[PDB]
Design a protein around this ligand. Structure first.
Ligand SMILES: *C(=O)CCCCCCCCCCCCC
Ligand SMILES: *C(=O)CCCCCCCCCCCCC
Ligand SMILES: *C(=O)CCCCCCCCCCCCC
Ligand SMILES: *C(=O)CCCCCCCCCCCCC
Ligand SMILES: *C(=O)CCCCCCCCCCCCC
Ligand SMILES: *C(=O)CCCCCCCCCCCCC
Ligand SMILES: [Cl-]
Ligand SMILES: [Cl-]
Ligand SMILES: [Zn+2]
Ligand SMILES: [Zn+2]
Lengths: 21, 29, 29, 21, 21, 29, 29, 21, 29, 29, 21, 21
């Protein structure tokens, strides 16, 4: 889950790329 | 937890800037 | 286009608030 | 789409709900 | 108070409707 | 508490979207 | 109108920062 | 009102203070 | 000008996300 | 700490509104 | 400047990186 | 540091004026 990964540890810009359609 | 809601509001703006024309899906549950 | 991007920035913020736990799919033009 | 309608006319809360999952 | 109600517990959309003029 | 200030900034944008033309009043104290 | 809504979104954010503990009343046109 | 002045001309910090409680 | 101010508000938000720990200098026209 | 990143996003918007035409520099490290 | 280019044309992530420290 | 001053204690508007170019 994006809430369980990028909100408990800081996510770099590429970490946000994974959830893009 | 209110801290979860605040962080989610920053995740949606991060996905919007990254995905752009591709689009994003937000699914906490 | 520039102003279209600005509207989408507030649009995803509005959708995040309105939907909440359900989530949403954002698809631009 | 969502941009074609809500970025040219103000969308009410019910209209935004149509885009929710 | 809105700070003592909607910031210590998450408020739904209708909970924000109460403070509207 | 800085966490109070951050949450208030999200309350004002929630009231603005909900109240719309009616308007809102923010009064923590 | 659409662009007027966008200005108000930043307007309430600016008013929240400037006033602070005093608070404010937001009334649109 | 607030929109009629600040959304057509940039409002300084003193002008915003006039709208504070 | 008003709309230029709005773009800068999102511009600094975008720059903050993209740069991160490096930081940035924001200089308007 | 994620709380640091959230607060920084509110500092950049505060500097933008305060500095205006002068501009600002954000340097956490 | 940054406004003269990115506020008239959409700036890619690489273009934003040119403004980073 | 601005992170070590204005993010551990709430900063007034003038406290943000110091870091302006
Ligand atoms: C839906 O409820 C999401 C499921 C996971 C939620 C985890 C919440 C953990 C509590 C917050 C810890 C981190 C605080 C920044
Ligand atoms: C992406 O290419 C946007 C597609 C939608 C068309 C944008 C222009 C529509 C007519 C409005 C012109 C107003 C600005 C001069
Ligand atoms: C003005 O000072 C508001 C009066 C009530 C403040 C309560 C603050 C409690 C400390 C924060 C607890 C919740 C943190 C998210
Ligand atoms: C709400 O109905 C807004 C009332 C203010 C008038 C809006 C239009 C004023 C003239 C500007 C036209 C510019 C856009 C074509
Ligand atoms: C600050 O003074 C802005 C300087 C840039 C020029 C703004 C106007 C450029 C031409 C666009 C006109 C469109 C609005 C009618
Ligand atoms: C770069 O890493 C900044 C150096 C100082 C960071 C201090 C972080 C302290 C942990 C957070 C405490 C306050 C939480 C709101
Ligand atoms: Cl926050
Ligand atoms: Cl805008
Ligand atoms: Zn905007
Ligand atoms: Zn925040």
């Amino acid at each position: 889950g994006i809430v369980e990964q990028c909100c408990t540890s800081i996510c770099s810009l590429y970490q946000l790329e994974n959830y893009c359609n | 937890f209110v801290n979860q809601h605040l962080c989610g509001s920053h995740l949606v703006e991060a996905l919007y800037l990254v995905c752009g024309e591709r689009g994003f899906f937000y699914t906490p549950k």
